[PDB]
Design a binder for these strands. Structure first.
Lengths: 145, 147
DNA sequence: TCCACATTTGAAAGGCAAATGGA
DNA sequence: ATCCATTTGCCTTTCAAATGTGG
C-alpha cells in the first residue's frame, strides 16, 4: 500500500526516460555496470519496469536506477561511448546432452557425495561447483511438487 | 541437391553451438564479436535463430561465412576477445515507440491508410519522432492489412 | 523521391533454473 | 557442505521496425 504506490510511480518514470533517450533495457543494465561496477541483464531491467520482482528486490534496485536516471539527463553521450573488464555474474548454460546425463545420474541417485561429484565434473567437462549446485537445485525441484 | 545444403548447414549450426558453449560464450557475446570482427553486430535473437536453422536458407548462407570465421578465431585468441568489452560499430538501431504513440498512430487507421507527405509532416514533430519512422510505420501497417 | 511487397533483423517478455544468501 | 528461499540471466520467440527491390 505504501511502497507499491511509489514504486509503480518510479517504474513509469524509468521507462519513459529510457525511451526518450533511445536506450534499450540491456543498455541500461549494461551501463549500470559502467557506473557502479555491478552489471545487470535486460531481463532484470524488464522485470523492474514491469513490477515482476519482489518488493525488497525492487527496493534494493531503485537506488541504482535512480542514480542511472540522474546521470542520463546531462552527459547522455559519454555513456553511449563508455559501455558500447567485467563484474559479469555468469550463468552456466549446459549442453542438452550433458543436462540429460546429469538427469540420468539423478533419480537413480538423488543425493550424491563429493566423491561422486568430482568424477562427474571432469567426466562431462564441467566445473565441480556446477555439478554440486546442479544437484541441489534438482533436489529442490523435487520437493517443489 | 537442395537437401545437401541443409545437411551441411545443420552440421555447422551444431558445431557452432557446441563451440560457443564449451568456450563459455553466450549468444549476445557471439553476435557482438561479429561486430568486433566484421563491422556489423548481430543480436542474440539473430544468433539464436541461426543456431536453430530458424532463418531462411538464403539468410543462413549470408551469415555462415561470418560465423565460420568466429569459430576459426575463438579456438585460439580467446583471451583478447573477452578483454574488449563487457569500438562501435556500425550497427544497428531499432526505434521502440511508446504504447501511447503507437495507439495514437493506430488511430489514423482505419481512418486513412495512405497519409501522403502532408500528414507525415504533422505527426512526426508532434509525437517527437523522425519523419522517416512515420512513413515506414504507415507502410508496415499497410502490409499487415493485406496479410 | 514515392509506393508495393518481400525479407532481414531486434526489443522485449516468458520459461526455466543457475547462482546466491541465510540459517 | 547441506535445505530452502530468493535473486537473476540464458535462451527463446512474437511482433514489427528497418531495409531491399523493382516499379
Amino acid at each position: 500500500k505504501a511502497l507499491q504506490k511509489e514504486l509503480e510511480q518510479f517504474a513509469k518514470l524509468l521507462k519513459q526516460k529510457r525511451i526518450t533517450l533511445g536506450y534499450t533495457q540491456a543498455d541500461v543494465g549494461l551501463t549500470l555496470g559502467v557506473l557502479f561496477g555491478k552489471v545487470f541483464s535486460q531481463t532484470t531491467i524488464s522485470r523492474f519496469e514491469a513490477l515482476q520482482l519482489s518488493l525488497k528486490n525492487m527496493s534494493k534496485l531503485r537506488p541504482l536506477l535512480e542514480k542511472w536516471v540522474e546521470e542520463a539527463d546531462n552527459n547522455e553521450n559519454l555513456q553511449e561511448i563508455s559501455k558500447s573488464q567485467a563484474r559479469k555474474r555468469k550463468r552456466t548454460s549446459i549442453e542438452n546432452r550433458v543436462r540429460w546425463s546429469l538427469e540420468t545420474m539423478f533419480l537413480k541417485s538423488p543425493k550424491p557425495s563429493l566423491q561422486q561429484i568430482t568424477h562427474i565434473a571432469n567426466q562431462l567437462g564441467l566445473e565441480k561447483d556446477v555439478v554440486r549446485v546442479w544437484f541441489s537445485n534438482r533436489r529442490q525441484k523435487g520437493k517443489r511438487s
